[PDB]
Design a protein around this ligand. Structure first.
Ligand SMILES: *c1cc(=O)[nH]c(=O)n1[C@@H]1O[C@H](COP(=O)(O)O)[C@@H](O)[C@H]1O
Ligand SMILES: *c1cc(=O)[nH]c(=O)n1[C@@H]1O[C@H](COP(=O)(O)O)[C@@H](O)[C@H]1O
Lengths: 257, 257
């Protein structure tokens, strides 16, 4: 039984961060996350401002920003509130719990202070989630677990993916969904976000593989497309964003009815 | 037909970085890597200077340093050159090749500019290594692949571990060995480095598990122990470093002869 984003936002077990997201997806008619894979703060903020209306989420790699400061992140928060989107830092945590706790809270980035969402690899075992949760819980943050990857030779398959699902189910106070290539849980309170998305067929020269929004959202039952180069490489990033938005939104609408 | 570290340093297929490491290990009689898990530059630099003579390597998490600057790294390299140890950034890369390339070279940290060694998880497939190599090779760097993890519930087992070994063999120009709990490769040009080490049985509250140096080096056939809290939390960190060095060194001597 397929529910709209708006209905899912009111599910009994839903995390407030997942609720917030689903509500804005419904309101704005977007299930598109911009992967803002740029090196300049000015470009990041210019993309966030311009594309903000078209997106439900902006995904960051702050460790690639040459001119990162916390003040940059303050302005990004301002744009996120204005345009109504979540910020997701794609840190892809993959260490022991005691370490990831500090990497999340601390250092120069202070990721927990500005990121609504983060993600973690499950390879280290559930300790990884426990450590993140000690930081994220009071801050009303959420976490996505990496159940599958988009890249060639990914080992995130079979029993590995199944472990990802179990680990999410067991930490549903904090874990709000998955990075995956398709639906991996049947629990509707879980979000499925899918990278490796482009309109055109292809890949890159470093193992990345692309599937279309229609395939990912429509056929494979994912919720949100994550799109970097498909948009960022365009001349007009706004036009490209709208193209991806409409593709993902209509694929979603068709699955519902 | 087990060779000494000194002999392994001279193997025809040895990587230059491994060779440099192996030689200093023999020279200093140390197969101990300090995990310098601290939040202040001053403390990182003080531990490096004080414990430098006892260690073959210093493992960093730069993303937990509250006051990182490239100047702090410049100074660490000075100490590394003085005391003769390598710098290993435990970045645990776990993303697509295109992304890790930028995370390794770029951002605020510019890891490749100062870390002799980095490590990577094998979960994304070989693209993760291809991406890092692009930066690492011109900069005369090495990489370790994470074949096993020390934490409870680790998924880095069986076929995954085998996959890591194959990936290293196929990228021997850049990959110099492993993060593992035991010997995973029969090829003597590869290093094995083992975290999750303390003299006493136990663990932490967040899934870390400990085995002793004699167990790891002696019975399980690893080359180097990685030790954080076992040293840093001791009252006397110098004496602590010396105990771990002597344990790991003796264990190595015994396995050899
Ligand atoms: C993370 C996990 C994964 O399985 N695949 C990924 O590509 N990523 C990240 O998503 C973005 C993909 O961007 P693009 O191929 O659309 O440009 C990227 O930031 C990568 O790190
Ligand atoms: C990395 C990989 C692994 O399998 N286990 C690990 O513990 N780590 C890193 O090694 C250090 C262990 O420190 P300690 O338990 O001796 O204090 C730590 O920096 C962890 O991130």
């Amino acid at each position: 039984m397929e529910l709209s984003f708006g209905a899912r936002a009111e599910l009994p077990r839903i995390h407030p961060v997942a609720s917030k997201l689903l509500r804005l997806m419904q309101k704005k008619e977007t299930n598109l996350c911009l992967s803002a894979d740029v090196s300049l703060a000015r470009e990041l903020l210019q993309l966030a401002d311009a594309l903000g209306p078209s997106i439900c989420m902006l995904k960051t790699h702050v460790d690639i920003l040459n001119d990162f400061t916390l003040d940059v992140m303050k302005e990004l928060i301002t744009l996120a509130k204005c345009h109504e989107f979540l910020i997701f830092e794609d840190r892809k945590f993959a260490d022991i719990g005691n370490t990831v706790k500090k990497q999340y809270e601390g250092g120069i980035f202070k990721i927990a202070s500005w990121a609504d969402l983060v993600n973690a690899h499950v390879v280290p075992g559930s300790g990884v989630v426990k450590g993140l949760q000690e930081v994220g819980l009071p801050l009303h943050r959420g976490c996505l677990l990496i159940a599958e990857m988009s890249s060639t030779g990914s080992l995130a398959t079979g029993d590995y993916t199944r472990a990802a699902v179990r680990m999410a189910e067991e930490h549903s106070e904090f874990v709000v969904g998955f990075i995956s290539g398709s639906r991996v849980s049947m629990k509707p309170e879980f979000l499925h976000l899918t990278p490796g998305v482009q309109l055109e067929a292809g890949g890159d020269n470093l193992g990345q593989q692309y599937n279309s929004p229609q395939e990912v959202i429509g056929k494979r039952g994912s919720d949100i497309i994550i799109v970097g180069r498909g948009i960022i490489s365009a001349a007009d990033r706004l036009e490209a964003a709208e193209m991806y938005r409409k593709a993902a939104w209509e694929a979603y609408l068709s699955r519902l009815g």
